[PDB]
Amino acid sequence: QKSSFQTRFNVHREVTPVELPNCNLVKGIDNGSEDLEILPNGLAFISSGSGKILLMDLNEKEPAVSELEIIGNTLDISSFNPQGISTFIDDDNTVYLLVVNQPGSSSTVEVFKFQEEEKSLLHLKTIRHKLLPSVNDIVAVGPEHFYATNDHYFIDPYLKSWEMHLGLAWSFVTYYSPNDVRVVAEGFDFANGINISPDGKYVYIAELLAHKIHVYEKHANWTLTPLRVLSFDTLVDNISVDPVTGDLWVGCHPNGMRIFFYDAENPPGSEVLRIQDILSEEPKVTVVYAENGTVLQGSTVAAVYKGKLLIGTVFHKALYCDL
Numbered sequence: 229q230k231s232s233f234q235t236r237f238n239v240h241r242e243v244t245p246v247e248l249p250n251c252n253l254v255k256g257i258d259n260g261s262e263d264l265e266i267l268p269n270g271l272a273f274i275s276s277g278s279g280k281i282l283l284m285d286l287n288e289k290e291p292a293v294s295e296l297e298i299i300g301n302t303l304d305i306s307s308f309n310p311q312g313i314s315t316f317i318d319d320d321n322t323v324y325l326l327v328v329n330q331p332g333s334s335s336t337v338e339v340f341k342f343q344e345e346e347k348s349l350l351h352l353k354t355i356r357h358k359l360l361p362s363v364n365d366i367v368a369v370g371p372e373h374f375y376a377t378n379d380h381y382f383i384d385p386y387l388k389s390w391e392m393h394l395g396l397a398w399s400f401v402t403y404y405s406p407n408d409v410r411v412v413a414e415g416f417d418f419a420n421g422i423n424i425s426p427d428g429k430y431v432y433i434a435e436l437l438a439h440k441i442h443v444y445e446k447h448a449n450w451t452l453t454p455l456r457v458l459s460f461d462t463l464v465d466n467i468s469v470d471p472v473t474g475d476l477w478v479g480c481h482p483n484g485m486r487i488f489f490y491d492a493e494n495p496p497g498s499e500v501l502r503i504q505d506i507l508s509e510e511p512k513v514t515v516v517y518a519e520n521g522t523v524l525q526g527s528t529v530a531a532v533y534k535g536k537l538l539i540g541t542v543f544h545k546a547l548y549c550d551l
């Protein structure tokens with residue numbers, strides 16, 4: 229029990245550095261960049277839990293961030309508190325952005341339409357459901373269709389907290405669509421990152437406190453069946469997938485004590501993994517970037533675009549590096 233706490237929170241871990249050539253802090257990101265997603269054309273959305281969605285054009289040489297204006301009357305901005313995000317590009321090239329929201333005491337998924345010329349997000353729909361009690365991240369598979377991780381079974385934060393420390397592992401994953409919402413996987417100890425292979429045939433789920441990434445075959449009827457489970461010596465948080473290769477790019481918290489019981493004199497470090505050939509017998513895992521937090525603290529996500537690496541954090545900055 230003190231033993232399972234030590235292993236779940238990886239309380240002994242320290243970080244061997246892995247450096248990258250030319251890394252710059254992104255000016256204007258100082259209060260979190262928890263999740264991000266990069267479109268094929270190099271525009272990157274970043275959420276920051278005011279809650280905001282930020283935009284970077286990664287085709288520029290030193291991209292600057294701008295704050296996207298949210299418009300519409302279906303959303304209260306004043307309680308907007310974004311967590312994970314996901315995009316869906318329709319047949320006509322309409323870009324939808326799905327954003328997990330934690331407005332006060334509950335959980336929603338907000339659906340926006342991205343209006344490129346205006347640099348704006350038009351709110352379309354607030355989704356909520358009983359099978360979405362505690363949403364951490366989603367992967368979109370249509371404008372209003374996604375898989376969602378619930379990082380807890382309970383809604384009440386006092387109960388979440390007991391639920392986590394008791395080690396219940398009741399977190400679960402929900403398939404959500406206008407006609408049909410169901411649990412597709414369950415029994416996780418803090419499910420969180422989630423993503424999908426470019427051909428739509430596999431779904432990847434990060435189980436934070438177990439230090440695992442689960443690979444599920446995804447079927448024509450939207451059901452998932454377990455295929456493989458990879459384990460790591462780090463708390464895996466968000467998963468990004470490179471659409472050209474299918475590689476996973478994963479933001480990780482080496483030592484979970486530092487990220488869950490925050491201490492400015494012992495702040496969390498950062499770590500990015502690349503996973504290739506995830507279906508093969510020895511998937512290739514590489515630490516691409518790793519540090520103890522003297523530059524970037526609490527890395528949650530990383531993705532790559534034409535030789536650059538962008539890395540976001542729970543409550544700190546963001547880092548842009550050459551690979």
Ligand SMILES: [Br-]
Pocket residue numbers: 382383384387
């Ligand atoms: Br509850």
Ligand SMILES: [Br-]
Pocket residue numbers: 243481482483486495496497498520
């Ligand atoms: Br750390």
Ligand SMILES: [Br-]
Pocket residue numbers: 244245518519520521522
């Ligand atoms: Br370091």
Ligand SMILES: [Ca+2]
Pocket residue numbers: 263264312313314365366367422466
């Ligand atoms: Ca996401």
Ligand SMILES: [Ca+2]
Pocket residue numbers: 262364420465466528
């Ligand atoms: Ca997270």
